Amino acid sequence: EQLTTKDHGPVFGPCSQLPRHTLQKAKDELNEREETREEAVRELQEMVQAQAASGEELAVAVAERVQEKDSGFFLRFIRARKFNVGRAYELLRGYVNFRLQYPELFDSLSPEAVRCTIEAGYPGVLSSRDKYGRVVMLFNIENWQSQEITFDEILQAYCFILEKLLENEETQINGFCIIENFKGFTMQQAASLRTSDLRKMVDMLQDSFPARFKAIHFIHQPWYFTTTYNVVKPFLKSKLLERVFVHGDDLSGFYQEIDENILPSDFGGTLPKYDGKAVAEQLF
């Protein structure tokens, strides 16, 4: 403990120094400041082609994609799998396979139409970090219409946001956190959700991206939220299922994990209404 919300660096912009005992926090997940990082990428890079040498359909496609990638990129998968070369490659397999499982998020991906979804605040990105230093994700279901914005467009925006925020080294070491504001979650929206869309989102959150989702928060959800929850519930692994938190209207243990002071007005915070325009501009 003994850490404030301002004891951390910035989001969005790629980092510079690794201080604030986050490098020590990194060391607390099997990291060493020394010769580890350098060769680990090399050991992975060597592994990527070595397993592709067997002529396996996926392993080749894996080596096909990352053939033109930088050293920092491969280190993401190392910091994601607590510095384990084997585990890191398995994540990379699930990484590539995710694009193969779902091409509707990476095919005709025009960056011009994506920003329009981000500026709509879907999903939202808190410009500040939590008391643990994680990128707090935002999503307000109130007044959301599926006919205007597809569930897939959200994930497309979700991916791009994840693709770029993981440049920041402190994000890789601290992780992420999503806030789901289900105040305006009507039964009309409940039924209009496709089960395949939920699998699509869960397949993202699990074993695909080098991110450390450390908490999921649901607020102001109705009495019938458990209906949708129990359908997703089988999709979740034990690791993530235990990281999902439902509060309702009793936020007695909510404003400890996520400080109110850094929260928008949309999420019971002191800050003004979430602005998707300004956040999207910092991206591009």
Neighbour tally for 270: CB within 10 Å? 11
DSSP one-letter string for the chain:
----TTSS--SSS------TTHHHHHHTTT--TTTHHHHHHHHHHHHHHHHHTTT-HHHHHHHHHGGG--HHHHHHHHHHTTS-HHHHHHHHHHHHHHHHH-GGGTSS--HHHHHHHHTTTSSEEEEEE-TT--EEEEEE-TT--TTTS-HHHHHHHHHHHHHHHTTSHHHHHH-EEEEEE-TT--HHHHHT--HHHHHHHHHHHTTTSS--EEEEEEES--TTHHHHHHHHTTTS-HHHHTTEEEEET--TTTTTTS-GGGS-GGGT-SS-S--HHHHHHHH-
178: exposed, middle or buried (Cβ count in 10 Å: 0-12, 13-18, 19+):
buried
180 is in an annotated binding site: yes
Contact 83, 42 (CB under 8 A): no
Note the residue count of the chain: 284
**How far, in Å, CA of 241 to CA of 146, rounded?**
26
Fold of 1-101: Helicase, Ruva Protein; domain 3 (1.10.8)
Residue of 41, 39, 107 lying closest to 70 (CA atoms):
41
- CA 14 and chain centroid, separation: 16
Task: Provide the token pair at 116.
Answer: 């329009």
**How far, in Å, CA of 74 to CA of 80, rounded?**
10
User: In CATH, what is the architecture of 102-284?
Assistant: 3-Layer(aba) Sandwich (3.40)
Angle at 179 between CA 259 and CA 200, to 5 degrees: 155
User: In DSSP terms, which residues pair with 139 in a beta bridge?
Assistant: 180
User: In DSSP terms, which residues pair with 245 in a beta bridge?
Assistant: 217
169 is in an annotated binding site: no
* Domain ranges, ordered by start, for the chain: 1-101, 102-284
Contact 157, 176 (CB under 8 A): no
